């Protein structure tokens, strides 16, 4: 039954959007928050979704559970640990998971995320704890894992700490920086704090990726490339509305982090037209298949592979070409990237 019954590579998925329902119950219960339900699947139906909704509808999902996970020191380590385990079942051999350390913080973070009262969990140790849970996960379930840290469009004041956090924990899982949280706000790509952070990223050798084009115009995709100096684009479906941009990214081998199921459940893509990925497919574009938020979207990597092959006619060779490009574009050192490529080359025959 499963679509691509071979090893995979994932470069786009949010930790704070890949938490087991049961683990949220456990913590919400043990802390004093209570969720809109007390049964696993019950909680999985209310904070998840089976049909496309609007932005605020989507955003509300986080409002439910995040206050239950964020703040607790061992809740963060457990979610990271359980994350690696999840990828194992999906058959992923290499995965880059991202997140905003600040949105899990409850100390030294203004404003303080999701209401939440003050405390002592500083952003700095939030990522260190994720590192830990991630590394244990790697050794216990057998998946290679790296972490990307996220900046938030609306809160550019946190950006400097992000790059610093990336440089401080270099190697120890964190290999890149990201920009997330509503590319729709005017001139957000160009906010000084954001551009200075990415400028710092180049100056200290930390890789770069930017959410852009999912629901933003081609221009935001262009700002991400020309100003912030990205190496990869999250989604970036809208770069099609600008041909010299597209034509240029094609010859420059830009990597697109695609999440087809997600683009549906968020409205990014209308079922009326043909997904932006078939166009990429037909143009031999360097892109990857990604889950994004398995919790909110009640999916798994397979969910996305099923869709590409079911309603888009994706063949097993396209899936291989795809994942191999994913490995070339990963933010892995060259030695570990060769090793990774090699693995997939032998296993893809
Ligand atoms: C960067 C983090 O992991 C997050 C934090 C979620 C969040 C917190 C506060 C404000 C936020 N604004 C967004 C947001 C994301 C996309 C658009 Cl087009 C508009 C708003 O997401 C937010 N995350 C997780 N999944 C997504 C996602 N799929 O976009 C974002
Ligand atoms: Zn995303």
UniProtKB/Swiss-Prot annotation:
Which tissue types show expression of this protein? Expressed in gastrointestinal tissues (at protein level).
Q: How is the cofactor bound?
A: Binds 1 zinc ion per subunit.
- Site-annotated residues for Important for interaction with adenosine receptors and increasing their affinity for agonists: 55, 59
Q: Locate the site labelled Important for catalytic activity.
A: 235
Q: Which GO terms describe its biological process?
A: adenosine catabolic process; cell adhesion; hypoxanthine salvage; inosine biosynthetic process; negative regulation of adenosine receptor signaling pathway; nucleotide metabolic process; purine ribonucleoside monophosphate biosynthetic process; T cell activation
Where in the sequence is N6-acetyllysine found? 51, 229
Residues that hold Zn(2+) according to the record: 12, 14, 211, 292
This protein's cofactor list reads: Zn(2+)
Write down the chemical reaction(s) this protein catalyses. adenosine + H2O + H(+) = inosine + NH4(+); 2'-deoxyadenosine + H2O + H(+) = 2'-deoxyinosine + NH4(+); cordycepin + H2O + H(+) = 3'-deoxyinosine + NH4(+)
Q: What GO terms are given for molecular function?
A: 2'-deoxyadenosine deaminase activity; adenosine deaminase activity; zinc ion binding
Identify the enzyme class.
hydrolase
Looking up CDD domains in the UniProt record yields:
ADA (cd01320)
Record membrane topology: Peripheral membrane protein
Could you name the active-site residues?
214 (proton donor)
Keywords assigned by UniProt, alphabetized? Acetylation, Cell adhesion, Cell junction, Cell membrane, Cytoplasm, Cytoplasmic vesicle, Hydrolase, Lysosome, Membrane, Metal-binding, Nucleotide metabolism, Pharmaceutical, Zinc
Q: Which InterPro entries match?
A: A/AMP_deam_AS (IPR006650), A_deaminase (IPR028893), A_deaminase_dom (IPR001365), Ado/ade_deaminase (IPR006330), Metal_Hydrolase (IPR032466)
- Does the record bear rRNA processing in its keywords? no
What Pfam families does the database record attribute to this sequence? A_deaminase
GO CC annotations?
anchoring junction; cytoplasmic vesicle lumen; cytosol; external side of plasma membrane; lysosome
Enzyme Commission number(s) from the entry: 3.5.4.4
Q: How does it assemble?
A: Interacts with DPP4 (via extracellular domain). Interacts with PLG (via Kringle 4 domain); the interaction stimulates PLG activation when in complex with DPP4.
PANTHER family reported for this sequence: ADENOSINE DEAMINASE
What is the stated purpose of this protein? Catalyzes the hydrolytic deamination of adenosine and 2-deoxyadenosine. Plays an important role in purine metabolism and in adenosine homeostasis. Modulates signaling by extracellular adenosine, and so contributes indirectly to cellular signaling events. Acts as a positive regulator of T-cell coactivation, by binding DPP4. Its interaction with DPP4 regulates lymphocyte-epithelial cell adhesion. Enhances dendritic cell immunogenicity by affecting dendritic cell costimulatory molecule expression and cytokines and chemokines secretion. Enhances CD4+ T-cell differentiation and proliferation.
Q: What is this protein called?
A: Adenosine deaminase
**From which source organism is this entry?**
Bos taurus
């Amino acid at each position: 039954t499963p679509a691509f019954d071979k090893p995979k590579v994932e470069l786009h998925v949010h930790l704070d959007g890949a938490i087991k329902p049961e683990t949220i119950l456990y913590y919400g219960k043990r802390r004093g928050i209570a969720l809109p339900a007390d049964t696993p699947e019950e909680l999985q139906n209310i904070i998840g979704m089976d049909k496309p909704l609007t932005l605020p509808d989507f955003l509300a999902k986080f409002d439910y559970y995040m206050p239950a996970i964020a703040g607790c020191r061992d809740a963060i380590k457990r979610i990271a640990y359980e994350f690696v385990e999840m990828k194992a079942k999906d058959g992923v051999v290499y995965v880059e998971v991202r997140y905003s350390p600040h949105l899990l913080a409850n100390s030294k973070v203004e404003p303080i995320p999701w209401n939440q009262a003050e405390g002592d969990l500083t952003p700095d140790e939030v990522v260190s704890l994720v590192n830990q849970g991630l590394q244990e996960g790697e050794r216990d379930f057998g998946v290679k894992v790296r972490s990307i840290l996220c900046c938030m469009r609306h809160q550019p004041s946190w950006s400097s700490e992000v790059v610093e956090l990336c440089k401080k924990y270099r190697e120890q899982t964190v290999v890149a920086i990201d920009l997330a949280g509503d590319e729709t706000i005017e001139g957000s790509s160009l906010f000084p704090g954001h551009v200075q952070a990415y400028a710092e990223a180049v100056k200290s050798g930390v890789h770069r990726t930017v959410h852009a084009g999912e629901v933003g115009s081609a221009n935001v995709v262009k700002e991400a490339v020309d100003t912030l100096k990205t190496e990869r684009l999250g989604h970036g479906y809208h770069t099609l509305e600008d041909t010299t941009l597209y034509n240029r990214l094609r010859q420059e081998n830009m990597h697109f982090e695609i999440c087809p199921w997600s683009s549906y459940l968020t409205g990014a893509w209308k079922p009326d037209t043909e997904h932006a990925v078939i166009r990429f497919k037909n143009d031999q574009v360097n892109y990857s298949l990604n889950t994004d938020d398995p919790l909110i979207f009640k999916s798994t990597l397979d969910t996305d592979y099923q869709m590409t092959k079911k309603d888009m006619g994706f063949t097993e060779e396209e899936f291989k070409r795809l994942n191999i490009n994913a490995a070339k574009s990963s933010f892995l050192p060259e030695d570990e990237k060769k090793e990774l490529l090699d693995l997939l080359y032998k296993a893809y025959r």
